[PDB]
Amino acid sequence: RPTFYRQELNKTIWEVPERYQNLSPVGSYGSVCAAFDTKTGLRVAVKKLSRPFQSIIHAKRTYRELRLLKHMKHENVIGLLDVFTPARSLEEFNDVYLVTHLMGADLNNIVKCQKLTDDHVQFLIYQILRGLKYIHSADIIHRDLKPSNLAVNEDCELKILDFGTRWYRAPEIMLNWMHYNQTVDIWSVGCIMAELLTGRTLFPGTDHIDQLKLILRLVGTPGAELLKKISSESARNYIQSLTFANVFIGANPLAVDLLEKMLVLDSDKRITAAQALAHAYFAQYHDPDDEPVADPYDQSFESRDLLIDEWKSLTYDEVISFVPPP
Numbered sequence: 399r400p401t402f403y404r405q406e407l408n409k410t411i412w413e414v415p416e417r418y419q420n421l422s423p424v425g426s427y428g429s430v431c432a433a434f435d436t437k438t439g440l441r442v443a444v445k446k447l448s449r450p451f452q453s454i455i456h457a458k459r460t461y462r463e464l465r466l467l468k469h470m471k472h473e474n475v476i477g478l479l480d481v482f483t484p485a486r487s488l489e490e491f492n493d494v495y496l497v498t499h500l501m502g503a504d505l506n507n508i509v510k511c512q513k514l515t516d517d518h519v520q521f522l523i524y525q526i527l528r529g530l531k532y533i534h535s536a537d538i539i540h541r542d543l544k545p546s547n548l549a550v551n552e553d554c555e556l557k558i559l560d561f562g563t564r565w566y567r568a569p570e571i572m573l574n575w576m577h578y579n580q581t582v583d584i585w586s587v588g589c590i591m592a593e594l595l596t597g598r599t600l601f602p603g604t605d606h607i608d609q610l611k612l613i614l615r616l617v618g619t620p621g622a623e624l625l626k627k628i629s630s631e632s633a634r635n636y637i638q639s640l641t642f643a644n645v646f647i648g649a650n651p652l653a654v655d656l657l658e659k660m661l662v663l664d665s666d667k668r669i670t671a672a673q674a675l676a677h678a679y680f681a682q683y684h685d686p687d688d689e690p691v692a693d694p695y696d697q698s699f700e701s702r703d704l705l706i707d708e709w710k711s712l713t714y715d716e717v718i719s720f721v722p723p724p
């Protein structure tokens with residue numbers, strides 16, 4: 399057990415291993431500080447969870463977040479550098495701290511409402527796709543992918559985050575459809591990509607209905623095959639009452655082709671992440687031997703209704719069993 403020290407930050411007492419120095423608040427689920435990790439030489443973000451075991455819902459959430467972070471081992475997806483508790487036993491366990499690489503720019507910061515060059519767009523979207531292939535292979539769907547959930551460093555390395563607008567959500571998410579396909583996230587990539595190419599938001603809806611109307615105006619009324627998949631006659635009648643190489647003028651035709659395959663209303667006909675990686679638009683970056691898939695992810699916990707003390711114990715087990723990455 400390393401030796402811990404104490405310090406007052408964000409209105410509570412933080413207690414961290416000595417390896418972590420120069421804590422400085424940076425945001426506030428709880429609270430985040432920047433630090434320097436003297437063991438590794440990395441700038442890190444240390445998150446101290448707020449009220450992790452206050453209720454059944456908080457406890458399950460805490461367990462979910464830890465299980466997710468511990469599973470994610472991939473260059474383009476946020477990973478866990480460390481997890482700790484000052485507690486010496488389960489009975490003493492009340493606090494969880496999570497550590498990852500410090501991130502200081504998201505994709506909005508990278509763009510600044512400027513068209514990126516085509517080569518740049520290829521490299522960014524290639525990385526998002528490469529991440530999404532990995533996440534989707536573990537049977538995980540992000541469901542709210544957007545620029546603020548995409549960290550980019552100074553060498554233009556991108557990571558998918560699950561933290562920091564409805565503009566990039568899939569339309570079926572916006573309709574509380576359920577039964578989501580992993581291609582919900584592909585919708586979102588098409589929205590991001592469009593914006594990188596043009597410098598403008600693709601579907602800047604003012605409200606929920608406005609957004610849906612903008613979407614229908616771009617990609618058109620559902621076709622016959624999609625209309626068969628909607629049981630409600632009223633939904634159909636309403637949709638019909640509401641109803642690329644032109645909108646993306648000047649762009650690389652391979653970018654337009656890809657956009658057309660991602661921004662498809664019918665989720666069952668959207669390109670998958672793995673098929674998108676093999677699209678010609680990415681020939682300069684594509685490597686089929688370096689687009690890894692995840693180990694299987696045991697999500698049996700998600701359907702469980704457990705008591706607080708069991709969610710806390712499971713979490714404690716995951717804290718103890720953590721092995722830092724290479």
Ligand SMILES: COc1ccc(OC)c(CCC(=O)Nc2cc(-c3[nH]c(SC)nc3-c3ccc(F)cc3)ccn2)c1
Nearest residue numbers: 424425430443444445496497498499500501502503561
């Ligand atoms: C240092 O100078 C800056 C310049 C610009 C800037 O804006 C992006 C910021 C904000 C930096 C920031 O908040 N970085 C950060 C946050 C986190 C973070 N944020 C959240 S909100 C729920 N959670 C985490 C986090 C931290 C550790 C962990 F294991 C998991 C998630 C992770 C990594 N980096 C800082």
Ligand SMILES: CCCCCCCCO[C@@H]1O[C@H](CO)[C@@H](O)[C@H](O)[C@H]1O
Nearest residue numbers: 475476533538539540558559560700
């Ligand atoms: C690091 C990027 C990975 C994507 C993180 C999102 C996957 C979250 O996982 C999910 O949390 C939701 C919250 O109630 C539930 O709706 C989903 O059932 C659960 O699966």
Ligand SMILES: CCCCCCCCO[C@@H]1O[C@H](CO)[C@@H](O)[C@H](O)[C@H]1O
Nearest residue numbers: 573574575610627628629630633636
């Ligand atoms: C502007 C859009 C009008 C509303 C469109 C809602 C149509 C989708 O509604 C959905 O249809 C599915 C297929 O029948 C059902 O399984 C889903 O429960 C329902 O959410």
Ligand SMILES: CCCCCCCCO[C@@H]1O[C@H](CO)[C@@H](O)[C@H](O)[C@H]1O
Nearest residue numbers: 569570575577578579627663664665
């Ligand atoms: C904007 C109003 C029309 C939106 C139509 C969205 C259609 C989304 O696509 C649908 O997604 C479901 C998974 O969620 C699948 O079960 C359906 O088979 C697929 O047709």
